[PDB]
């Protein structure tokens, strides 16, 4: 087997694990369950991922990449950059009600892996930093260190997403989160709108 | 041995572990090292804490309780409640440069335990919620769900503390963090100051 072939197989196993965990639940699904449900060869999942936690980490990495792409696209496509930033921040919270993110990232990875890795966190912060730097340069956002401000913003959103995902009434919590978020964000503006 | 006697001994071992980890470093200090340095009986630390990670969790729990007390006291003693809230928030960041918090909580527990437990997080949020509820009732802070707003605020502070503790220049990062924080907080006010 080549590296290329192994990488292709890993990707198929990861996609299938995501599909099964969606239908059945992560805690509910053992490695043997996944093997049976997906009609995989004995040992394939252990060979690629080591253990269930390893599989979960790999799934989370893919999900994270997808999230980053979706969020970057909101601010990239924005007609007004401040509104694009608000929309991106709100979208992060709105993702906490999507079943895969809610369950796999905000419940399962939270409990099993201890939440986002420090590396993943630094990555999210760097992305938000690019946006903040831009808005400061535009004179939209008041002067501050971009990286510092991005850490604060990312932290608020990450915690609020956990909180929304803890509710029996996530829909209610989402509206509350977004409304509170708007009060925090409005102070960033040089000139109120 | 009574429960009371075991609890007393546990507390002495925890205090000693804190002292040794301060002098020597958590990663640098094995359970056997701690046993030797503190002249403990063979097996005492394993008997009380199970493993090193268990000891670390127990140390973190004590540190957390101390932090909560210190922070609650800032807003309790405040002459102006808004300034007391700003001071409490800044103090959380300032704690990221204290050697024990910086190292044990923001570096070691981060890497080893995955940061604060969800329970610890909910506890911090409930404390901040009490304060926010008060400030909203006073008409100082604009209407919002207290728990939602506390989640956002706590998240910002927790992440910014990690960020400050990642720097080679924590002092520089602290000033940047505090300045950025002030921009986020100012939007909470009904009436600007």
Automatic annotation (TrEMBL), chains A, B:
Keywords of the record: DNA-binding
PROSITE patterns found in the cross-reference section: HTH_TETR_1, HTH_TETR_2
Top-level taxon of origin: Bacteria
Gene Ontology molecular function terms on file: DNA-binding transcription factor activity; transcription cis-regulatory region binding
InterPro entries according to UniProt: DNA-bd_HTH_TetR-type_CS (IPR023772), Homeodomain-like_sf (IPR009057), HTH-type_TetR-like_transc_reg (IPR050109), HTH_TetR (IPR001647), Rv0078-like_C (IPR049484), Tet_transcr_reg_TetR-rel_C_sf (IPR036271)
Ranges of the DNA-binding region feature: 30-49
Residue span, HTH tetR-type domain: 7-67
Cited SUPFAM superfamilies: Homeodomain-like, Tetracyclin repressor-like, C-terminal domain
Name assigned to this protein: TetR-family transcriptional regulator
Organism: Pectobacterium atrosepticum (strain SCRI 1043 / ATCC BAA-672) (Erwinia carotovora subsp. atroseptica)
């Amino acid at each position: 087997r080549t590296r290329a072939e192994m990488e292709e197989t890993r990707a198929t196993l990861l996609a299938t694990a995501r599909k099964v965990f969606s239908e059945r639940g992560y805690a509910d699904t053992s490695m043997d369950d996944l093997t049976a449900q997906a009609s995989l060869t004995r040992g394939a999942l252990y060979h690629h991922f080591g253990d269930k936690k390893g599989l979960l980490a790999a799934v989370v990495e893919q999900i994270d990449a997808e999230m980053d792409e979706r969020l970057q696209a909101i601010s990239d496509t924005a007609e007004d950059d401040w509104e694009g930033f608000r929309c991106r921040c709100r979208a992060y919270l709105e993702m906490a009600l999507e079943p895969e993110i809610q369950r796999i990232v905000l419940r399962d990875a939270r409990a099993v892996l201890g939440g986002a890795s420090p590396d993943s966190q630094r990555h999210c912060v760097e992305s938000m930093q690019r946006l903040i730097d831009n808005l400061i340069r535009q004179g939209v956002v008041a002067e501050a260190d971009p990286q510092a401000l991005a850490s604060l913003i990312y932290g608020s959103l990450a915690e609020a997403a956990f909180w929304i995902a803890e509710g029996e009434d996530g829909n209610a919590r989402l509206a509350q989160g977004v409304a509170a978020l708007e009060l925090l964000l409005r102070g960033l503006l040089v000139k109120p709108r």
